[PDB]
Amino acid sequence: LICSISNEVPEHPCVSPVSNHVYERRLIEKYIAENGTDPINNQPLSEEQLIDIKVAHPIRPKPPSATSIPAILKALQDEWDAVMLHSFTLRQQLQTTRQELSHALYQHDAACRVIARLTKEVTAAREALATL
Amino acid sequence: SATSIPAILKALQDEWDAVMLHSFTLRQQLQTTRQELSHALYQHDAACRVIARLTKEVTAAREALAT
Amino acid sequence: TDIMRNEFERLAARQPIELLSMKRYELPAPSECVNNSMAQ
Amino acid sequence: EEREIDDTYIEDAADVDARKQAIRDAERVKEMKAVQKDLPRPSEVNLRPLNVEPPLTDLQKSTMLHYDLLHEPSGNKKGKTVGFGTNTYLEHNPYEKFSKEELESLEKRLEINRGH
């Protein structure tokens, strides 16, 4: 759609066969006549090496759409590759919650033995003192 | 396998149908493990308030035993 | 000059029958469905 | 002769008071993320420590009546330091129990999806 040298919409696109990029024929021709090189990569290129854009041959194409079978298959990659990252958000957050639950239930199991002894000791002090 | 191709259509349907539920079941379990974790944190902090009153009843007892 | 792909493709075109897809997600029913719900 | 210093100090003092209230509001509420149920508290009892945390949950949340608002920071710090003293081998017993816990409910997930 654009020419990489000028930045205009090229009215005669010709693609080079050393640095794959669509140049405008009239612009690239002058670049070759200046010095036999490709403007981007600075690799050697002649005018015969450059090739105009063409209809493929005899197989008829249709424009790139959502229906087209290959475009639909690359779509289903996007679906699954995104959903695979959705699983990491829940696998990583699960490893924090279960790690905080493990330390929480351990602090609960370490503390409730001290609640059981104070309920013993404060009632034993009331059982001892009241009898005297 | 040699497997019929019209059947391979329904396999890919079932496998996406399965992965959609294998992703769903793994997320509601994460929400309820965090939810049941939050119920433990309330009991953890509620218990250490109940120990403060039990320590007072022990402190009141140690004063009466001395007298 | 292709693998298994060509056998089922030529059979599908000759027979004039497309392989059936997952006709499930659209219909469903209120009141196994705990999974089907979590899928949705 | 102070000028815009008392206003800066009053903003600094008002900033300090907001830092004390937000932190001491609640540990669970301030960190990260229930319906009122007196019948669930009545059904769970039908044991005393479970009833204490139930009334504690109903108080903080405020068919739901509020009342409890008198039960402070220094007594909790000494309570936390004392329980820490009472609590390699302890790290492995917590990792094994976490794997065991990792190893009715279906209706809640379906309704969670109906919301989604």
Side-chain angles (χ1 to χ4, degrees), chain A residues 10 13 17 33 36 39 44 56 58 61 63-64 66 70-71 75 82 104 110-111 116 124-125 128 130, chain B residues 2 6-7 11 18 40 46-47 52 60-61 64 66, chain C residues 12-13 16 24-25 28-34 37 39, chain D residues 13-14 18 22 26 34 40 42 49 54-55 73 75 79 83 85 94 115:
Chain C
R24 185 207 301 102
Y25 313 107
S31 324
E32 290 88 315
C33 302
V34 178
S37 65

